[PDB]
Design a protein around this ligand. Structure first.
Ligand code: MG
Ligand code: MG
Ligand code: MG
Ligand code: MG
Ligand code: MG
Ligand code: MG
Ligand code: MG
Ligand code: MG
Ligand code: MG
Ligand code: MG
Ligand code: MG
Ligand code: MG
Ligand code: MG
Ligand code: MG
Ligand code: MG
Ligand code: MG
Ligand code: MG
Ligand code: MG
Ligand code: MG
Ligand code: MG
Ligand code: MG
Ligand code: MG
Ligand code: MG
Ligand code: MG
Ligand code: MG
Ligand code: MG
Ligand code: MG
Ligand code: MG
Ligand code: MG
Ligand code: MG
Ligand code: MG
Ligand code: MG
Ligand code: MG
Ligand code: MG
Ligand code: MG
Ligand code: MG
Ligand code: MG
Ligand code: MG
Ligand code: MG
Ligand code: MG
Ligand code: MG
Ligand code: MG
Ligand code: MG
Ligand code: MG
Ligand code: MG
Ligand code: MG
Ligand code: MG
Ligand code: MG
Ligand code: MG
Ligand code: MG
Ligand code: MG
Ligand code: MG
Ligand code: MG
Ligand code: MG
Ligand code: MG
Ligand code: MG
Ligand code: MG
Ligand code: MG
Ligand code: MG
Ligand code: MG
Ligand code: MG
Ligand code: MG
Ligand code: MG
Ligand code: MG
Ligand code: MG
Ligand code: MG
Ligand code: MG
Ligand code: MG
Ligand code: MG
Ligand code: MG
Ligand code: MG
Ligand code: MG
Ligand code: MG
Ligand code: MG
Ligand code: MG
Ligand code: MG
Ligand code: MG
Ligand code: MG
Ligand code: MG
Ligand code: MG
Ligand code: MG
Ligand code: MG
Ligand code: MG
Ligand code: MG
Ligand code: MG
Ligand code: MG
Ligand code: MG
Ligand code: MG
Ligand code: MG
Ligand code: MG
Ligand code: MG
Ligand code: MG
Ligand code: MG
Ligand code: MG
Ligand code: MG
Ligand code: MG
Lengths: 136, 78, 386, 59
RNA sequence: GGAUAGUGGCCUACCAUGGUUUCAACGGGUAACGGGGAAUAAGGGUUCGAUUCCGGAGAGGGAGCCUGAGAAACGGCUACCA
RNA sequence: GCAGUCAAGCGUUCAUAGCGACAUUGCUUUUUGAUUCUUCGAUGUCGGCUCUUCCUAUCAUACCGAAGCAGAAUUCGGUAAGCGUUGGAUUGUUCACCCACUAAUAGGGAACGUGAGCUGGGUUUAGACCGUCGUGAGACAGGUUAGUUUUACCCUACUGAUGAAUGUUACCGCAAUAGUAAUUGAACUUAGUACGAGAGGAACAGUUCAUUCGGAUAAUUGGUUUUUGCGGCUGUCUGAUCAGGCAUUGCCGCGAAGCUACCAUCCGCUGGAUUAUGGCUGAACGCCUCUAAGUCAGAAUCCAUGCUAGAACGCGGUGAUUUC
RNA sequence: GUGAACAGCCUCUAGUUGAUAGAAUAAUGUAGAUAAGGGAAGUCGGCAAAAUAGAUCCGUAACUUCGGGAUAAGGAUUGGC
């Protein structure tokens, strides 16, 4: 959540704390994303900031095209294996933890994304709905 | 308000009850409880589990009046 | 030195002492303002928390992402069989506070409430109120005078009601008596209403409309002696800490040379009296109504009791209140519902809630079927049949 | 607008491979099989139109 | 024996221990499709041929396959990857 | 370390919007000194962890005044400590230095708070290596490595828990005093609007969500499993079968109930009086002035409302009050 | 008996059943365990704990004093009948 995201994300259960590495679902040349921060996060002594879905994280590329490594870049979470609950009462969880590289406005860097996506993320980032195949 | 069925057990999962799993290939699986979800997560074959619907269905279990002569005819001749 | 890192204080201070409460029946420390333009009626009610269940309904939030979409919410149901008015207490204003002037009582009193005045009911001779009821033998002129006193003085009026515990699956057999403020018209009109209801009964529909924001007052669950870790939420200590770790490391500074009231210490957790507010009423059910759990969209003839009954409580056979969410108190505890102390629009209040389906599947386990019919339908015939 | 197909399963939508002689599919070449989506055969609230035939008149 | 339209380790079961190599196997390279041919004129050669004709291979990369006399076709389908 | 006074100067012009020389007056006791009063028949040495309260010389958040404030931004100042002030990499570190989020990542006190609270990385015994010095033993506000952290049953404090005696016993209540809590952000809309040549570019009302904090609760989901509840498995033992024993709860899958998680759900009230500040009326002082008398408005403040406890030596109403 | 085995676990002979009891099962402990999603962000430091493990088969690097490194690494397999 943050800059350039139209709409409002209901509180979705967390589960991707800093240090977590998630699969890169786009075709930018990166295959993993090491989370290092969470845009729009809280501050509480010793509480590790976490991202849940559609949240904008600051990450680094640990395995991928050398031109994407050794640097920090924004990323948007599209899949999280931690089960959360929607207002419609469903306790759902994906099979992995995945995100895609994006710029601060929210525009992506990859042509498209491989794998399903959560509506909460699509409903939050417009350029994701375009490059996303199947939501939820 | 749809009442779904377990992807393993085949039992009715009312609103809220159970869990939902979105496989990597975007295939969906709905479970009524931790039990069916665990058996599935264990890679157990439902038609080998004596209590699931698709097991009973595949094993001729409890259907004698649903398959019998009926009186469903039509109106004809104009 | 200073704290070296800021963090908010653990626990709320306006909830001290964290001691056991004085009684299971939490006290209603406040009643709503009184507009005498309205008719006389109760301002609170008694019940017993029976349990919780799940409900599905359409959400009317003009601007929410779930607007007009179905939502699944948690709700509690409190068995609230009609209360019975047996007395009226008038209170007068004094420079040292409000004080009770007189307490007129009903002629006859049900044994339910009568045993409340006893601690060993069977051994006793059950002579309570025996001499009192007799001041009614003549025209009586006692009751009339004391009531007349309440009219001339006692600018605030309260009725003495008690629960019909006999009509509840509970086994306690001891009714619950309490004072309820009348928020109707003229003080004379108030006492008049109280007198006219002596030994009579009052239902919940006559005191609570549907969709109303009501507050709940009750004693929370008991947990006994609790370590400072879970009693206050303090951080667990590291593994290598000798002399235990579910504690607070620095109980306080060298100066002041005393442990401070504001420090977190080990003690009694639970059994605290709480006053939760703004619980929207979803359903106001009647016990003499089959299909209690039915809705205009569901329509199946089923009561609210889950299959197998409410775990640890039983069945609901009387009027009941279904409030959105959870309320303080545990299963089988005497609860007091009270009309909120203020008008609140909030766009969340005033929501004309309309249920769609109420869960009735068993709660004593991972239930699958709503009604025994549904169970037999999806399951077929068994060996215990035929 | 997805049409249903009698007898299959699932009052939801699925994707099958259809051939000659099969419902909801008009081949365009000889031996041409195509993968197309079809709605189930169990009525649901998602249906915009229901096809029905009378077998007995009323009153 | 099976499978093929058919021969054949094509494939399978059993069995054996063979098969190629300084007369260069095996591997590597190729800014490699092969050939008819083109360029350079003592001769012997040296260099080139993606490219009008013949043959082969492919249809973004693979694999799979329906129709058929004929396709493992792609201005056919199916799946995966891009 | 912090704050003034005078005002030559800086600031296009202009001393004081924001600054400020020369000088001069002060405050502070988380600097370092200076002293050597107390402790050498011992007051356990730095850091961090944890947790509480306090200070304001206020970083953020509330309301304001000023600008060299057009908008946006920012700066100066007032009332203000009600509230919050974080996640990491190297370092034993305090400090430092980056990375990163954030409304902000403000400074401090509490025996430089906090070792019968921990930890013991550093320092600072005994082993040992190297460098420098010494003939040598040995030495180094030089560099390395290894090196036992004791006791609470007392009193008090604090947290919770019983309790004699005011005729006996019981039910309903009052409310002194004490405690008290909520917090901050984003988006939609306003609105590409106000303002500007332009680039740029707000806010008040409304709505949807979120952060920090708190009190509950267990319908749902997840965790937990001596339900040793059901099934399964290895080894042995009861001749076999059945059914079982033993293997520090033998192992495994499922597993209710209970307990429980921002890993789950629900709830977190509204009146008044003020501050700064801006004003009304209005003298002193025939004019002028928010002030002198009187007076309006107004803040995350304050007092109430609400919430918690109920004085075991504060209290009210009401029931029943014994025969060997 | 299991198994490579004087291992561990169960048994025969022989020998014990000797350790103050009784009732509960608050906090905090000592000792034994499990934990969703993340996976060292904890910390002086992965302290602690977890993970690994037998056997058969395949596969095994730099470097080397040629003796090693090497169970290197990395894999598949295992009951019963
Ligand atoms: Mg967030
Ligand atoms: Mg920390
Ligand atoms: Mg590398
Ligand atoms: Mg595109
Ligand atoms: Mg479970
Ligand atoms: Mg501080
Ligand atoms: Mg009287
Ligand atoms: Mg515990
Ligand atoms: Mg230790
Ligand atoms: Mg001390
Ligand atoms: Mg042959
Ligand atoms: Mg050979
Ligand atoms: Mg050669
Ligand atoms: Mg080539
Ligand atoms: Mg060539
Ligand atoms: Mg030639
Ligand atoms: Mg030549
Ligand atoms: Mg050619
Ligand atoms: Mg070429
Ligand atoms: Mg071809
Ligand atoms: Mg091309
Ligand atoms: Mg093709
Ligand atoms: Mg073409
Ligand atoms: Mg062609
Ligand atoms: Mg001067
Ligand atoms: Mg000048
Ligand atoms: Mg000027
Ligand atoms: Mg200083
Ligand atoms: Mg000294
Ligand atoms: Mg001394
Ligand atoms: Mg000394
Ligand atoms: Mg001492
Ligand atoms: Mg000393
Ligand atoms: Mg001391
Ligand atoms: Mg100017
Ligand atoms: Mg200044
Ligand atoms: Mg000011
Ligand atoms: Mg404060
Ligand atoms: Mg104060
Ligand atoms: Mg920091
Ligand atoms: Mg750290
Ligand atoms: Mg560190
Ligand atoms: Mg540097
Ligand atoms: Mg000091
Ligand atoms: Mg100290
Ligand atoms: Mg110590
Ligand atoms: Mg040390
Ligand atoms: Mg030491
Ligand atoms: Mg060290
Ligand atoms: Mg030493
Ligand atoms: Mg010396
Ligand atoms: Mg030294
Ligand atoms: Mg050392
Ligand atoms: Mg050692
Ligand atoms: Mg002692
Ligand atoms: Mg005490
Ligand atoms: Mg006496
Ligand atoms: Mg806060
Ligand atoms: Mg706009
Ligand atoms: Mg301009
Ligand atoms: Mg909370
Ligand atoms: Mg809790
Ligand atoms: Mg339950
Ligand atoms: Mg469960
Ligand atoms: Mg068993
Ligand atoms: Mg066996
Ligand atoms: Mg048998
Ligand atoms: Mg034995
Ligand atoms: Mg043993
Ligand atoms: Mg165990
Ligand atoms: Mg459970
Ligand atoms: Mg109010
Ligand atoms: Mg007041
Ligand atoms: Mg004034
Ligand atoms: Mg004045
Ligand atoms: Mg004056
Ligand atoms: Mg406030
Ligand atoms: Mg309140
Ligand atoms: Mg008292
Ligand atoms: Mg009294
Ligand atoms: Mg023998
Ligand atoms: Mg002993
Ligand atoms: Mg013993
Ligand atoms: Mg004992
Ligand atoms: Mg324990
Ligand atoms: Mg387990
Ligand atoms: Mg875990
Ligand atoms: Mg991992
Ligand atoms: Mg680490
Ligand atoms: Mg790592
Ligand atoms: Mg170290
Ligand atoms: Mg370190
Ligand atoms: Mg270890
Ligand atoms: Mg494990
Ligand atoms: Mg090695
Ligand atoms: Mg086998």
């Amino acid at each position: 959540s943050g800059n350039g995201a139209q709409g409002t994300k209901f509180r979705i259960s967390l589960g991707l704390p800093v240090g977590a590495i998630m699969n890169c679902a786009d075709n930018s040349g990166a295959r993993n994303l090491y989370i290092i921060a969470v845009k729009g996060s809280g501050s509480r002594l010793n509480r590790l900031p976490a991202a849940s879905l559609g949240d904008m994280v600051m990450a680094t590329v640990k395995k991928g095209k050398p031109e994407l490594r050794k640097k920090v870049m924004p990323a948007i979470v599209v899949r999280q294996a931690k089960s959360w609950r929607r207002r419609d009462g469903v306790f759902l969880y994906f099979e992995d933890n995945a995100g895609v590289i994006a710029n601060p406005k929210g525009e992506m860097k990859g042509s498209a994304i491989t794998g399903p996506v959560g509506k909460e993320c699509a409903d939050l980032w417009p350029r994701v709905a375009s490059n996303s195949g199947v939501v939820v | 308000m749809k009442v779904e069925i377990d992807s393993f057990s085949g039992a009715k999962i009312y609103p809220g009850r159970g869990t939902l799993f979105v496989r990597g290939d975007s295939k969906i699986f709905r479970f009524q409880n931790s039990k069916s979800a665990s058996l599935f997560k264990q890679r157990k074959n439902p038609r080998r589990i004596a209590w699931t619907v698709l097991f009973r269905k595949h094993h001729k279990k409890g259907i004698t009046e649903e398959v019998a002569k009926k009186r469903s005819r039509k109106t004809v001749k104009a | 030195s200073h704290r070296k890192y800021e963090a908010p204080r653990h626990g709320h201070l306006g909830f001290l002492p964290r001691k056991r409460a004085a009684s299971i029946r939490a006290r209603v420390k406040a009643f709503p303002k009184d507009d005498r333009s309205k008719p006389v009626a109760l301002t609170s009610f008694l019940g017993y928390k029976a349990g919780m269940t799940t409900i599905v309904r359409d959400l009317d939030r003009p601007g929410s992402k779930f607007h007009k979409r179905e939502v699944v919410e948690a709700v509690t149901v409190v068995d609230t069989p009609p209360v019975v008015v047996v007395g009226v207490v008038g209170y007068v204003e004094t420079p040292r506070g409000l004080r009770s002037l007189t307490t007129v009582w009903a002629e006859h009193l049900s044994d339910e409430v009568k045993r409340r005045f006893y601690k060993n009911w069977y051994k006793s001779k059950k002579k309570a109120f025996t001499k009192y009821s007799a001041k009614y033998a003549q025209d009586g002129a006692g009751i009339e005078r004391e009531l007349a006193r309440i009219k001339k003085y006692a600018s605030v009026v309260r009725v003495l009601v008690h629960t019909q515990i006999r009509k509840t699956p509970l086994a306690q057999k001891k009714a619950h008596l309490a004072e309820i403020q009348l928020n109707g018209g003229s003080i004379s009109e108030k006492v008049d209403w109280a007198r006219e209801h002596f030994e009579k009964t009052v239902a919940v529909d006559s005191v609570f409309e549907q969709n109303e924001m009501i507050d709940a007052i009750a004693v929370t669950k008991g947990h006994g002696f609790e370590g400072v870790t879970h009693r206050w939420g303090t951080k667990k200590l590291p593994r290598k800490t000798h002399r235990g770790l579910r504690k607070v490391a620095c109980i306080g500074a060298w100066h002041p040379a005393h442990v401070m009231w504001s420090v977190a210490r080990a003690g009694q957790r639970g059994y605290h009296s709480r006053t939760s507010i703004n619980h929207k009423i979803y359903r106001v059910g009647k016990g003499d109504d089959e299909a209690n759990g039915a809705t205009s969209f569901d329509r199946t003839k089923k009561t609210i009791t889950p299959m197998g009954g409410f775990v640890h409580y039983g069945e609901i056979k009387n009027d009941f209140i279904m409030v959105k969410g959870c309320i303080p108190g545990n299963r089988k505890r005497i609860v007091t519902l009270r009309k909120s102390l203020y008008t609140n629009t909030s766009r969340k209040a005033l929501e004309e809630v309309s249920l769609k389906w109420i869960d009735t599947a068993s709660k004593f386990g991972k239930g699958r079927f709503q009604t025994p019919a549904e169970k037999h339908a999806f399951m077929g015939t068994l060996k215990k049949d035929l | 607008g997805f049409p249903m197909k009698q007898g299959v399963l699932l009052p939801t939508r699925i994707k099958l491979l259809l051939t000659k002689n099969v419902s909801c599919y008009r081949p365009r070449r000889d031996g041409e099989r195509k993968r197309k989506s079809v709605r189930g055969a169990i009525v649901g609230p998602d249906l915009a139109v229901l096809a029905l035939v009378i077998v007995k008149k009323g009153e």
